[PDB]
């Protein structure tokens, strides 16, 4: 057949633990006699919709859930059939990330979100609120340091604060998103962006701080805190910096709302191996031993499977990742989300520089996203 019956071909990106996944496949092959081939093609997220559109490609694809919206719109993904008992083995918010048009189209694997990263030697008790941070910065500036540096140029990094007091991208209801219910220019978003702009106006942050500056400042020990994700941990210079990772600060008593990415496993709609793929994903990969094999190769971060997350969370960085993810916002998987990134990027830049008042900046963004 076009996709070969009686084997599994799996695509996963080259920055994931594909050797560990291959070992899960080897266990599957020993139990079933079914060959499992793990591949990590370049540009696989672009290749997959091309080959799957002709009924070809891998049996299983692994990618962040938000890309699977577009795949599901094109009918590239099988509706999966986990029973209710299996569903109860994963944190319930992860299933929401893999619903499209009401139907489950993938298995959640792992969970990623921003956290507050802090220098224990500069700040052994990091702030629980954003409101504390101006006064803390003044104290640290007096001793030659700063409180907080993070990427202000990209809304992925500023949204956690902007949205804390009631902002949101699109309202989620019943496995679907309301494209008319956008939370970009409401009073909560205005409050959060005002607080951010005030941090800049009061000289606690510089409006041109980007990813490079924040990472370098924190790694040099110049700033007590940054905001970044699990991809950054390996790069933190632990020779210079005894760092911790914790829950993001609250604003107006409300948690920060980082976007959540859920690494997910979809089954090709054209696969003749859908029962094999289900068996592999449910009863080999989504087990403590299967996730351990992948994680030992390249860390997954926090995971969707409760039994293994409860083990991983002995690492406080992973516990913090999951806490911030549970309080955060699943990234919408709908096409209108592309309008969100560029509209909000523009709004925050214009607000932080003074080109636009906060209110008019967010109003213009709201209009574009809802057009
Ligand atoms: Na194999
Ligand atoms: Na406090
Ligand atoms: Na448990
Ligand atoms: Na264990
Ligand atoms: Na005002
Ligand atoms: Na409006």
UniProtKB/Swiss-Prot annotation:
One of its GO terms (biological process) is DNA damage response. GO terms for molecular function: carbohydrate transmembrane transporter activity; maltose binding. Disulfide bonds: none annotated. CDD domains: PBP2_MBP (cd13656). Induction: Induced by maltose and the transcriptional regulator MalT. Permanently repressed by cold shock in a PNPase-dependent fashion. The complex is composed of two ATP-binding proteins (MalK), two transmembrane proteins (MalG and MalF) and a solute-binding protein (MalE). PANTHER family: MALTOSE-BINDING PERIPLASMIC PROTEIN, MALTOSE_MALTODEXTRIN-BINDING PERIPLASMIC PROTEIN. NCBIfam families: PRK09474.1. This is Maltose/maltodextrin-binding periplasmic protein. It comes from Escherichia coli (strain K12).
């Amino acid at each position: 057949m076009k996709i070969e019956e009686g084997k599994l071909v799996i695509w996963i990106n080259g920055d994931k633990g594909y050797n560990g996944l291959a070992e899960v496949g080897k266990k599957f092959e020993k139990d079933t006699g079914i060959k499992v081939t793990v591949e990590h093609p370049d540009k696989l997220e672009e290749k997959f919709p091309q080959v799957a559109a002709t009924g070809d490609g891998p049996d299983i694809i692994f990618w962040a859930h938000d890309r699977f919206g577009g795949y599901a719109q094109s009918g590239l993904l099988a509706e999966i059939t986990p029973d209710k008992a299996f569903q109860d083995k994963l944190y319930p918010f992860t299933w929401d990330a893999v619903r499209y048009n009401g139907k489950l189209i993938a298995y959640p694997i792992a969970v990623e979100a921003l956290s507050l990263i802090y220098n224990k030697d500069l700040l052994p008790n990091p702030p629980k609120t954003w409101e504390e941070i101006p006064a803390l910065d003044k104290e640290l500036k007096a001793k030659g340091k700063s409180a907080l540096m993070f990427n202000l140029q990209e809304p992925y990094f500023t949204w956690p604060l902007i949205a804390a007091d009631g902002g949101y991208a699109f309202k989620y209801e019943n496995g679907k998103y309301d494209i008319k219910d956008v939370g970009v220019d409401n009073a909560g978003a205005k409050a959060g962006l005002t607080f951010l702009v005030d941090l800049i106006k009061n000289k606690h942050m510089n409006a041109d701080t980007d990813y490079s500056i924040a990472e370098a400042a924190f790694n040099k020990g110049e700033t007590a805190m940054t905001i970044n994700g699990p991809w950054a941990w390996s790069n933190i210079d632990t020779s210079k910096v005894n760092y911790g990772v914790t829950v993001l600060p609250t604003f107006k008593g409300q948690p920060s709302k980082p976007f959540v990415g859920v690494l997910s496993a979809g089954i090709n709609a054209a696969s003749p191996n859908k029962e094999l793929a289900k068996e592999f994903l449910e009863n080999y990969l989504l087990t403590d031993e299967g996730l351990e094999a992948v994680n030992k190769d390249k860390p997954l971060g926090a995971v969707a499977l409760k039994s293994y997350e409860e083990e991983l969370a002995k690492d406080p960085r992973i516990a913090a990742t999951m806490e911030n993810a549970q309080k955060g916002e699943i990234m919408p998987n709908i096409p209108q989300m592309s309008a969100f990134w560029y509209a909000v990027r523009t709004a925050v830049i214009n607000a932080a520089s003074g080109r636009q008042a906060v209110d008019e900046a967010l109003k213009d963004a709201q209009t574009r996203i809802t057009k």
